């Protein structure tokens, strides 16, 4: 029945938690949307906690900056910044990540400037939640992160954090591109001094983040490699793929670990889905290691599960197969036919990479050709010089020669012509393009090509 | 920056004495400068005290006279600011260094605190 | 009727030129009598709402605008009055800024920027305030929760310099609103309480309430003041409004009065008059009486009869303290417990985490609660709420459910998983988890290893008796490691310096292990 | 399927055409397959539409507690201070110049805002549209709205719907119009000839001329320019009639019917919605996209895709 | 109840102690870490808000700023410690973060020719015990009498002046209370002299007396918040069994490194009794404890 706004806020928070981390029931999402679409906060009078919770849960369930509830919450958070204590700061900051309006930007900057003044007066839970919430948005406040870094460094010398705190801190700090060596050193020190309390389910993401940050150190990398050995028989497919990705990011050929992980993964081929297949092949491509026998099994399994591929999975699998030389005619035909229907879901990277990988493989379906070529006009503004050059070479091999498709590509190529003509990896790649099109096509581009440079 | 409890504990004091040497060399010329506000005076005096740098009595006299003249305005105009903590440390600094620096500012700050004209920083 | 239909149609189609006073008049006549259908024609109200929203609101007092919004909200359409702008240069005066603050406070919409602007503009013209305006602006600021102590201190100084030009209720309001501001210097508080003490001769029954509220918010630091007022109370204890005596008891509880001579006589007067209290004052009269340890059978019967009246429809946040109070009283009050349990059964879906945790905690050892259905249904909700519970509520709920014998195996597994990311600060925060896991005695070994790693640092603190409980819980849980047993053995050896037959079998096996 | 971050598992795609179904907003959800038989329209209404070329529904299809929300969405879609999100997913709007004017319209808005997405699947109008189209499947083509300005609200001259739908091979459409507010001949109610859909054996009348500055009466009396003597006599037989609508009433029209709408003389704005349906057996004519940034078809290809979702299917 | 501790600055720990005793730089912070972790696991404190590192080593001493008497908090005079004013500001901020007092009281600072130093103050039943001598002068004692000597029945607040010698440390380090009605002191001159003087001051009361070995640092939180835990340095053996025979539960915190720098256990922590602000005649839930349902 009808209830006060505070009870609504509590039930909404529980609904968000159940949807987030205890199974994605669609009925719960639909019921929560129904309840939150017809509820307003103006009449009642509540403290900051209930209003912040309402805003956060509403934004989580797909409410943009136009609905009544979001505006009603945002005006309050605009007019009562002093009522926003360190308790409710991370909730609002997380709630304003997806929104990109004017008021959302101003609220986020208000919270950011308030945070780097109470840096010294925080504790473990507030520090963890604040740093994760700030990592969510994409802010670039270097001084705030430095102020929090000193606080975490000091607080780590007395040993309070558990494994989850370490995982959250490592993930949030890695995602923000903060390459501070001493901070991660203290993180690692506190991690290694916690005996028997870092389960693999909490060990693996820490390794993932430590690989993703990109600090150059072989010593702690070798320590990570040796520590991961004893649990090789305990993980499942997802953790094996994550370990492959992380150790590819590390960039050190730990052959023993790669071998034992391969012998482990070959047993778990059945549990692999498309996402793990793509992740493993992409990691192997990045590191630069050839493992044929495993590749054949992965290719056959991917053949069995073609329907489940997404845009990312195709853009990874096709690139890896093109790079590694292992070709399957039936698998490639199925992948091209499937990507024909999913032609709209490609982002800037996926379309160009898939087109180039198909062009170099000499496997040119026509339905895929037209479906991918028509899409190029929409995205052409987003690409870079090298990606545009690769897409143009793939189109030249595609033999389309249609002005409606080709007109924006040449404009963009002229846009980045300095980088376009200064790429040695592809100096021969422009020759086939300009052979296929000819001087009668683009007089300015041809004049620049003939020119010295 | 210099560390006594470290791997280079052999020249800690020979470096601290040098640092104090320049400190004196810049302190002896401090009477030539105007001080815009009390917090500048507090910062300079805090460094001098926590670093044990001798200063000539003339520079002390100029500093304390300027502080007295500046602090007169807020008290006499009963409003605009100086926090009560700031007055506490200023009174304490003069008490440490002696009453003769400003034999009037002593009772002036004492009366100003008696009237409660300087509110707390968190108020 | 015919012309009425035409007038209604002209109103709905939105061609009439309506000014705000006309819509106020129509709203009033619909609010009070509504003989003809006004609140039952949605289109008419929609048109009136549009007319009100588009019309200028600057020609009405705040109260009538609030009435318009209130009558609009009843029929099912949201409505909020337009906000006001700060006055310009020439329109500035001590009277207009108070109007701005008053409109801010009345319409239940607040803003910090306008508050800062008006407090910046008020200072230069502070000398134009009438002596009866400062005591209004002081209670206006303290109603907006404006944590600015220097301006309020200046206002208090000016008010107290104008002592003779205010009535008793003005001093009452000034004191109660002043006590609600944290950053005030204590000398001003001393002087205000002295001024209050000087004016006992003119006080009224409501006008004691504010001073008592201020003293309760301040605490024992002003104890002598409460000594004087209570003395002045000795001449009226024969007849007081029950709220006044309830406030007297609350101040006694928060002051730690070491003189029962007057507490007794006040309580005897309250005993008979408590029947007229509402829910909140009844509950806190109960708490005040219990804290000073006066509950006997004669007053317990009367207050049980008084609380059974509300027992059917308690507010959930007023249930746990009542159970707590009845826990620490040896008299027989089983029926009150029974009805409170029955009421708490219904509110299970709407109860928060902390309320459920405390309710379960207080029923740890109640025998009639061993068979009541709340042994299971509550636990079911405890399954869902577990993702929100803090360490304190989690420990309390686990302790209560384990003491009640709840046989859900996975519950304590999820509890351990939740607690492993929180950490523990003391043995009490960890004991319920082991106690719950002891109902079955088996669980995956990794969590046992983690529990041992957590227990090992805590061995240095608990005494000889508690180490026995720790050993009893560890051995039954199939623990195997050694660096935990030796940690407990060292602390045991710290007390007993020799192996002796006096210690129980667990101590004997621990001393040889 | 790639891995979605933890705090992004409940969001919705950029374009709402992807969620193959109705959101749980406004009315609860679609009824069961057997529960679709209660929305049927009395046959007398069908014969009345056949005769007069238009017809009104016996009962309103919306309640005030939903119409206020729809009007809130309509007001939000017109902001010139903070442009409404998902603006780029609309077919065309009058605010593309960032200035607007005394008339506000948007087309294909069901891909941009909640609630109005759920309006498309409302059974009480979809089943009526299915019954009008000879008991077959129905398909949404494109939805648009109109919001007139204050007392300077301009009007719309006489028009035939099919004049904008030459791309469709047969004449097999229908139009539903929803009145979001109380409308009147002094506020913007529509006026339409009760027999203009049965003239010239279904031929299309010549396009009408108009001036952007003349008074409303001159724009109304330009009908004589198009008609002939024969149509003139029927015009005397069948004079134009204006229908007044209250909050939530729905009006069904035919694509061959001449219609126009008065201006706005009241003290505020007024809102209305137009939804256009197809039946089955509908094919394109030329090679290309029917609407900007839509699916391309063949010269004689049946019209179907993601942008034209099925709504109601009998049996 | 809250406690405040400060982490030392690693880069500037002194190489050697005042008497020339070598001090282990790493073992000092190790002992600090262990001591803080023990302080958490006590079941009487409510929280420990950790401060930040500060350069001067003397800043590790935090109890010299403020003295808590009865139901009020008091600020110590700043004479002789002029270089530690700024850190005081910062500590105040931490206090404001917790939610206790807004600002300190300014009684002693305005009393001219007043020299005082904490540690000389010991909280005892309903009263205080202040030690005369090298630090606290006579005028300070008279002023303390004016502020806190009331002589009304059922409302009296005793003040006790215990006289010691010049070489004696501050009274709170070798003469203390614990639990209730239990008195402990050092087994040396400053011990028997103090207990004898106190017994002459209030002969009508008798308390258990349990001595510690001289040079042993102990900390017991006495007051309305009754506690049954005592911290004792891991450098002595007889005091542990003596305190266990008194009826108390000792805890052996390691304090070897900190001793060489002349900092006691008392001079590291600062306990406060925060008055939660009750609003509108409304009480606040308290930390209840006991045995529920004693009648079946």
């Amino acid at each position: 029945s009808h209830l006060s706004a505070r009870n609504i806020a509590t039930e909404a928070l529980q609904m968000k938690k159940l949807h987030q981390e205890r199974g994605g029931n669609p009925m719960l999402a639909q019921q929560a949307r129904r309840v939150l679409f017809a509820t307003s906060i103006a009449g009642q009078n509540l403290d900051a906690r209930s209003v912040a919770l309402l805003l956060n849960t509403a934004v989580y369930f797909g409410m943009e900056s136009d609905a009544k509830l979001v505006r009603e919450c945002i005006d309050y958070c605009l007019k009562n910044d002093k009522l926003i204590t360190v308790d409710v700061l991370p909730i609002v900051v997380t709630a304003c990540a997806t929104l990109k309006s004017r008021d959302a930007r101003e609220v986020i900057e208000m919270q950011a400037q308030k945070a780097a003044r109470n840096a010294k007066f925080l504790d473990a839970k507030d520090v963890t939640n604040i740093i994760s919430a700030f990592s969510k948005t994409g802010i670039n406040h270097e001084k705030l992160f430095a102020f929090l870094s000193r606080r975490v460094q000091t607080l780590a010398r007395v040993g309070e954090f558990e494994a989850a705190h370490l995982v959250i801190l490592a993930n949030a700090f890695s995602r923000l591109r903060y390459r501070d060596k001493f901070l991660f050193g203290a993180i690692a020190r506190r991690a290694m001094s916690l005996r028997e309390r870092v389960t693999v389910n909490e060990l693996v993401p820490l390794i993932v983040a430590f690989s993703k940050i990109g600090l150059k150190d072989p010593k702690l990398s070798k320590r990570f490699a040796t520590k991961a050995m004893e649990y090789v028989d305990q993980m499942n497919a997802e953790q094996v793929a994550s370990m492959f990705m992380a150790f590819a990011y590390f960039g050190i050929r730990y052959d023993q670990l790669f071998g034992v992980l391969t012998n482990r993964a070959v047993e778990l081929i059945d549990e692999f889905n498309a996402q793990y297949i793509s992740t493993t092949l992409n990691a192997f491509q990045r590191i630069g290691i050839n493992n044929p026998e495993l590749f054949d099994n992965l290719a056959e399994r991917a053949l069995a599960v073609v329907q489940d591929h997404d845009a990312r999975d195709i853009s990874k699998t096709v690139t890896a197969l093109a790079h590694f030389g292992l070709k399957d005619e039936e698998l490639f035909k199925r992948l091209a036919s499937h990507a024909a229907s999913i032609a709209d879901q490609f982002d800037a990277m996926g379309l160009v990479n898939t087109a180039h990988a198909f062009a170099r493989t000499n496997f040119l379906q026509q339905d895929m050709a037209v479906a991918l070529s028509e899409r190029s006009v929409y995205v052409c503004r987003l690409l870079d010089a090298g990606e545009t050059r690769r897409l143009l070479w793939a189109l030249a091999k595609f033999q389309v020669r249609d002005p409606k498709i080709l007109t924006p590509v040449f404009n963009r190529c002229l846009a980045l012509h300095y980088d376009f003509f200064a790429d040695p990896t592809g100096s021969e790649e422009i020759e086939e393009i300009f052979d296929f099109y000819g001087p009668n096509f683009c007089p300015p581009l041809y004049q620049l090509y003939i020119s010295r440079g | 920056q210099v560390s006594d409890g470290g791997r280079n504990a052999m020249n800690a004091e020979p470096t601290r004495q040098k640092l104090r040497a320049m400190g004196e060399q810049i302190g002896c010329r401090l009477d030539e400068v105007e001080y815009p506000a009390l917090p500048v005076i507090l910062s300079i005096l805090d460094v001098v005290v926590t670093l044990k740098i001798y200063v000539p009595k003339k520079c002390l006299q100029v500093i304390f006279s300027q502080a007295n003249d500046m602090v007169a305005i807020v008290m006499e105009q009963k409003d605009d600011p100086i926090t009560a903590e700031e007055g506490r440390q200023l009174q304490a600094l003069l008490s440490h260094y002696g009453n003769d620096l400003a034999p009037e500012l002593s009772q002036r700050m004492k009366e100003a605190f008696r009237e409660g004209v300087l509110p707390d920083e968190a108020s | 009727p015919s012309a009425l239909h035409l007038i209604f149609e002209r109103c709905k189609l939105n061609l009439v030129e309506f000014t705000a006073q006309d819509v106020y008049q129509i709203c009033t006549t619909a609010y009070n009598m509504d003989t003809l259908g006004m609140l039952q024609d949605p289109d008419f109200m929609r048109g009136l709402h549009d007319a009100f929203r588009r019309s200028d609101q600057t020609v009405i007092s705040p109260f009538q605008a609030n009435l318009i919004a209130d009558t609009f909200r009843k029929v099912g359409i949201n409505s909020m009055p337009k906000e006001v702008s700060v006055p310009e240069e020439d329109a500035i005066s001590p009277e207009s800024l108070i109007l701005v603050l008053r409109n801010m406070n009345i319409t239940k919409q607040r803003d910090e920027r306008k508050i800062n602007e008006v407090l910046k503009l008020m200072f230069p013209i502070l000398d134009e305030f009438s002596p009866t305006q400062l005591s209004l602006t002081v209670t206006e600021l303290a109603r907006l929760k404006s944590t600015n102590a220097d301006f309020v201190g200046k206002l208090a100084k000016r008010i107290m310099e104008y002592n003779d030009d205010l009535s008793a209720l003005d001093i009452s309001s000034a004191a109660v609103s002043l006590a609600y501001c944290p950053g005030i210097s204590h000398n001003i508080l001393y002087r205000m309480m002295q001024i209050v003490e000087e004016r006992m001769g003119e006080f009224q029954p409501e006008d004691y309430i504010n001073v008592l509220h201020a003293l309760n918010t301040l605490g024992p630091k002003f104890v002598n003041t409460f000594r004087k007022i209570v003395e002045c109370g000795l001449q009226h204890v024969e007849n007081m409004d029950a709220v006044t005596l309830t406030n007297y008891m609350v101040c006694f509880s928060t002051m730690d009065y070491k003189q029962r001579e007057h507490i007794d006589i006040y309580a005897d007067a309250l005993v008979e008059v408590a029947t007229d209290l509402s829910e909140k004052d009844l509950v806190m009269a109960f708490i005040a009486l219990q804290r000073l340890r006066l509950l006997s059978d004669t007053m317990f019967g009367t207050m049980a009869s008084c609380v059974i009246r509300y027992a059917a429809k308690m507010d959930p946040r007023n249930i746990a303290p009542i159970m707590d109070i009845c826990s620490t009283v040896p008299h027989a009050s089983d029926h009150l417990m029974k009805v409170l349990m029955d009421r708490a059964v219904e509110c299970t879906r709407i109860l928060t985490a902390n309320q459920l945790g405390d309710i379960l905690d207080i029923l740890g050892l109640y025998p009639p609660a061993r068979e009541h259905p709340l042994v299971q249904l509550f636990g079911k909700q405890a399954r869902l709420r577990l993702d929100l519970m803090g360490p304190d509520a989690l420990a309390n709920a686990t302790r209560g459910l384990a003491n009640l014998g709840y046989a859900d195996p996975e519950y304590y597994a999820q509890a351990a998983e939740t607690g492993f990311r929180y950490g523990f600060k003391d043995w009490t925060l960890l004991e319920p988890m082991l106690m719950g896991l002891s109902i079955t005695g088996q669980c995956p070994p990794t969590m046992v290893r983690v529990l041992g790693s957590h227990i090992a640092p805590m061995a240095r603190s608990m005494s000889l008796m508690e180490i026995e409980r720790a050993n009893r819980y560890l051995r039954r849980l199939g623990c195997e490691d050694d660096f935990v047993y030796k940690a407990m053995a060292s602390r045991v050896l710290q007390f007993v310096k020799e192996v002796t037959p006096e210690m129980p079998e667990d101590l004997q096996v621990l001393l040889q292990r | 399927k790639s891995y979605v971050l933890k705090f992004l598992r409940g969001q919705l795609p950029e374009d709402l055409k992807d969620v193959n179904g109705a959101l749980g907003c406004l009315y609860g959800t679609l009824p069961d397959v057997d529960e679709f038989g209660q929305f049927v329209i009395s046959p007398d209404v069908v014969n009345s539409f056949h005769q007069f070329g238009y017809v009104k529904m016996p009962i309103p299809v919306l309640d005030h507690q939903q119409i206020d929300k729809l009007a809130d969405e309509v007001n939000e879609l017109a902001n010139n201070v903070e442009h409404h999100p998902k603006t780029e997913r609309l077919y065309a709007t009058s605010l593309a110049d960032l200035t607007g004017g005394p008339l506000f319209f948007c087309q294909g808005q069901w891909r941009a805002a909640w609630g109005m997405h759920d309006l498309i699947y409302l059974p009480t109008i979809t089943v009526a549209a299915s019954q009008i189209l000879n008991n077959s499947l129905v398909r949404l083509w494109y939805d648009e709205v109109f919001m007139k300005a204050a007392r300077t609200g301009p009007c719309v001259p006489w028009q035939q719907n099919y004049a904008r739908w030459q791309h469709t091979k047969p004449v097999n459409h229908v139009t539903v119009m929803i009145a979001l507010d109380t409308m009147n001949k002094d506020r913007g109610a529509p006026c339409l000839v009760p027999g203009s859909h049965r003239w010239r054996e279904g031929g299309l009348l010549p396009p009408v001329s108009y001036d952007p500055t003349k008074d409303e009466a001159h724009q109304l009396n330009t009908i004589w320019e198009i008609i002939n003597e024969e149509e003139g006599e029927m015009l005397m037989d069948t004079p134009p009639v204006t229908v007044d609508l209250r909050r939530g009433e729905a009006l069904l029209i035919h694509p061959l019917t001449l219609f126009a709408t008065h201006g706005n003389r009241s003290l505020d704005a007024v809102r209305c919605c137009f939804i256009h349906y197809m039946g089955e057996k509908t094919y394109a004519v030329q090679n290309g996209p029917l609407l900007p940034h839509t699916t391309k078809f063949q010269a004689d290809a049946m019209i179907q895709g993601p942008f034209y979702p099925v709504v109601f299917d009998p049996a | 109840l809250h406690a405040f501790v400060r982490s030392p600055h690693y880069r500037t720990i002194p190489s050697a102690g005042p008497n020339g005793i070598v001090v282990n730089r790493d073992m000092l912070v190790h002992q600090f870490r262990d001591f803080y972790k023990t302080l958490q696991h006590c079941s009487l404190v409510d929280k420990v808000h950790l401060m930040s590192e500060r350069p001067s080593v003397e800043a590790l001493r935090v109890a010299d700023q403020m003295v808590s008497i009865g139901a009020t908090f008091l600020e110590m005079p700043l004479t002789g410690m002029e270089h530690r004013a700024t850190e005081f500001m910062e500590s105040m901020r931490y206090v404001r973060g917790a939610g206790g007092p807004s600002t300190l009281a300014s009684y002693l600072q305005d009393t001219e020719n007043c020299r005082c130093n904490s540690g000389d103050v010991v909280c005892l039943p309903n009263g205080i015990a202040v030690g005369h001598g090298p630090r606290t002068n006579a005028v300070a004692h008279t002023t303390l009498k004016q502020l806190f000597e009331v002589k009304d029945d059922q409302f009296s607040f005793d003040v006790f002046t215990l006289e010691q010698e010049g070489d004696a440390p501050p009274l709170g380090d070798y003469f203390g209370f614990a639990g209730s009605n239990v008195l402990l002191t050092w087994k040396d001159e400053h011990g028997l002299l103090a207990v004898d003087q106190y017994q002459q001051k209030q002969p009508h009361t008798e308390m258990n007396v349990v001595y510690l070995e001289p040079g042993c640092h102990f900390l017991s939180f006495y007051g309305v918040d009754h506690t049954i835990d005592v911290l004792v340095q891991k450098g002595y053996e007889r005091s542990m069994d003596s305190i266990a025979a008194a009826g108390l539960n000792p805890i052996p915190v390691q304090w070897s490194e900190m001793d060489k720098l002349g900092i006691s256990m008392r001079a590291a922590v600062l306990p406060l009794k925060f008055f939660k602000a009750n609003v509108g005649g409304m009480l606040s839930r308290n930390k209840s404890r006991g045995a529920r349902w004693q009648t079946h």
Side-chain angles (χ1 to χ4, degrees), chain A residues 149 152-154 156-157 166 180-193 210:
Chain A
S149 169
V152 185
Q153 268 171 35
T154 280
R157 317 262 308 287
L166 273 295
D180 202 1
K181 166 208 209 60
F182 308 123
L183 178 40
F184 279 104
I187 297 177
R189 246 157 278 144
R190 174 62 175 158
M192 285 335 165
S193 97
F210 259 75

Side-chain angles (χ1 to χ4, degrees), chain B residues 1 3-6 46 49-50 85 88-89 92 96 120-122, chain E residues 11 13-15 25 78 82-83 85-86 89 93 96 103 109-110:
Chain B
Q1 178 162 349
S3 189
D4 165 39
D46 176 34
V49 156
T50 204
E85 296 91 344
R88 281 280 151 249
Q89 302 93 40
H96 176 109
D120 313 283
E121 69 98 23
Chain E
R11 203 150 49 73
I13 281 151
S15 38
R25 155 167 82 156
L78 197 143
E82 287 77 17
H83 58 277
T86 89
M89 271 166 228
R93 307 195 214 288
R96 283 155 191 146
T103 325
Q109 313 82 313
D110 293 67

Side-chain angles (χ1 to χ4, degrees), chain B residues 45-104:
Chain B
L45 282 185
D46 176 34
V47 175
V48 164
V49 156
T50 204
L51 246 177
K52 309 297 178 286
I53 329 305
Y54 152 75
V55 306
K57 58 163 296 314
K58 174 54 60 186
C59 316
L60 277 168
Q61 219 68 8
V62 176
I63 281 159
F64 274 117
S65 59
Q66 294 309 80
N68 175 32
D69 178 57
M70 286 321 191
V71 86
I73 282 187
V74 49
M75 149 265 288
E76 68 98 351
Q77 287 179 358
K78 65 215 71 48
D79 219 338
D80 284 351
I82 329 295
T83 79
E85 296 91 344
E86 268 135 28
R88 281 280 151 249
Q89 302 93 40
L90 191 45
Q91 171 86 66
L93 258 293
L94 169 162
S95 72
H96 176 109
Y97 282 63
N99 240 16
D100 58 338
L101 322 173
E104 58 279 9

Side-chain angles (χ1 to χ4, degrees), chain E residues 103-170:
Chain E
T103 325
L104 311 186
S106 294
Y107 299 110
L108 300 180
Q109 313 82 313
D110 293 67
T111 67
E112 189 43 49
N113 314 332
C114 165
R115 195 196 55 168
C116 186
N117 180 287
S118 182
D120 290 339
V121 166
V122 152
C123 313
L124 71 94
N126 172 96
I128 81 180
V130 281
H132 198 249
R135 292 162 220 83
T136 314
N137 43 47
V139 47
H141 267 152
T142 66
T143 48
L144 261 295
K145 258 179 57 196
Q146 325 308 289
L147 294 323
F148 296 103
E149 173 63 286
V150 82
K151 295 297 304 302
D152 169 37
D153 179 21
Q154 293 182 310
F155 297 76
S156 289
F157 212 78
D158 40 318
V159 70
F160 289 147
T161 289
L162 280 63
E163 254 280 22
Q164 308 218 247
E165 255 284 354
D167 75 310

Side-chain angles (χ1 to χ4, degrees), chain B residues 4-65:
Chain B
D4 165 39
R7 41 192 81 76
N8 204 330
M10 152 283 307
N11 214 72
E13 310 322 294
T15 324
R16 301 170 187 289
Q17 58 90 21
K18 180 217 305 172
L19 260 66
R20 293 192 202 86
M22 293 183 284
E24 309 267 357
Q25 167 270 334
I26 79 162
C28 36
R29 283 187 64 182
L30 277 169
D31 60 351
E32 298 165 34
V33 64
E34 190 274 332
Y35 304 99
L38 266 39
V40 168
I41 289 289
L42 296 202
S43 176
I44 284 200
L45 282 185
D46 176 34
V47 175
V48 164
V49 156
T50 204
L51 246 177
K52 309 297 178 286
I53 329 305
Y54 152 75
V55 306
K57 58 163 296 314
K58 174 54 60 186
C59 316
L60 277 168
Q61 219 68 8
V62 176
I63 281 159
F64 274 117
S65 59

